[PDB]
Structure 1
């Protein structure tokens, strides 16, 4: 309804619209990050509405810069606004300081846009995993609708985020190879995502610590991961 204002707290101290924008993400496609010392792996169920969709077009993983990739879950259209902002801030950083923006600084700038709602009617119904490589090493951050940002070692957002945290608890350690991280990322998506896992059905990306560069895995390259599992 419209009876409660947008800027209204609940009796248990949570802003309602935020608490409801978070319920919008649990409907969304599953995404996840694995920070390994070799690099950071982003994976994403595409959840294509039909076979006829060009799956490349509805890309859950987005290049923010050479060294930072965002994966979204929840309202895709909204994420495009957040990632558009990350890109503008990333490039403003390069412009101004002649250096790649830190992953944390890029997360903070993305969350600067997410506070300003009253200008914008509602929060963004998107949670973003932002994974990159800077001086600090490979890092993985999550933005919420609240504007909170949380560094994670591994995190899943969206539908099977709850079922995937359970798998990370069991399997994730801090001295993983990028190869094992990719293996894990896909192993989880297989268990969690509703459709049968195909090379076209999911998106995988890594920012490798060694070159500091983002590689979006082609379907060929994702089949190579499924082949070793």
Structure 2
């Protein structure tokens, strides 16, 4: 496994450690993101290893800034690193330009840390989704271990992703409400999760277009979503 150095291309023009880091993101818990004109929604399977875990502590959704959230899949500890950098970058942007960082600019600056490997032994085994609201309204991007951001309208990452890109293709239209989005989110998780979907087993957040602020759904408010289905 040290036969091929880490900067090596395969015969198909893929860097091997990147392709492998991607393979690690398919072992991760499913996360997903849905752009709506009313806001963005992120939702994550928590996938806790025990009832004895305190579920707030296994937080797959993270405030980057008042208006940006991220949700990881793959190696959580690797994700903590990226999100720390995003936080720092988003805040340096406020500092320097006295305004909130755009969501894309933020995703860029999080990919700017993922290029660095030869410095970092290996790539981050992490894909983020980064939802936010700025001047161009709600937005959802995906980072990969490649370092390649990609704006999306709906996305999944994780073991779910393939089954969840089935469901988006059928039920996602560019014009849904924030509640129809919450609903499609939680639906998808119900369908792809291993465990029974309960209000502690998942994590849901939204960044609303109107206020441009990010709300993390408490278990209560996630029941309020499960209610109508």
* TM superposition score category, shorter chain reference: over 0.9
1:96-131 deviations in Å (ceiling 9; x for gaps): 000000000000000000001000000000000000
Per-residue deviation at 1:57? 0.3
Cα distance in 2, alignment partners of residues 175 and 4 from structure 1:
47
> 2:56 is paired with a residue of what secondary structure?
coil
Cα distance in 2, alignment partners of residues 123 and 222 from structure 1:
34
Per-residue deviation at 1:71? 0.3
> 2:55 is paired with a residue of what secondary structure?
coil
Per-residue deviation at 1:210? 0.1
Cα distance in 2, alignment partners of residues 205 and 189 from structure 1:
14
Cα distance in 2, alignment partners of residues 65 and 149 from structure 1:
19
Per-residue deviation at 1:150? 0.2
Cα distance in 1, alignment partners of residues 42 and 3 from structure 2:
40
TM-score, normalised on structure 1? Answer: 1.00
Residue correspondences, number: 229
Per-residue deviation at 1:27? 0.2
Cα distance in 2, alignment partners of residues 91 and 8 from structure 1:
35
Cα distance in 2, alignment partners of residues 174 and 160 from structure 1:
22
TM-score, normalised on structure 2? Answer: 1.00
Cα distance in 2, alignment partners of residues 141 and 188 from structure 1:
19
Per-residue deviation at 1:141? 0.2
Per-residue deviation at 1:73? 0.1
Give unpaired runs (5+ residues) of structure 1.
Answer: none
Cα distance in 2, alignment partners of residues 218 and 21 from structure 1:
32
What residue is the counterpart of 1:40 in the other structure? 40
Cα distance in 1, alignment partners of residues 146 and 198 from structure 2:
34
Cα distance in 2, alignment partners of residues 27 and 226 from structure 1:
26
What residue is the counterpart of 1:133 in the other structure? 133
Per-residue deviation at 1:194? 0.5
Runs of at least 4 residues off by over 6 Å = none
What residue is the counterpart of 2:20 in the other structure? 20
> 1:12 is paired with a residue of what secondary structure?
coil
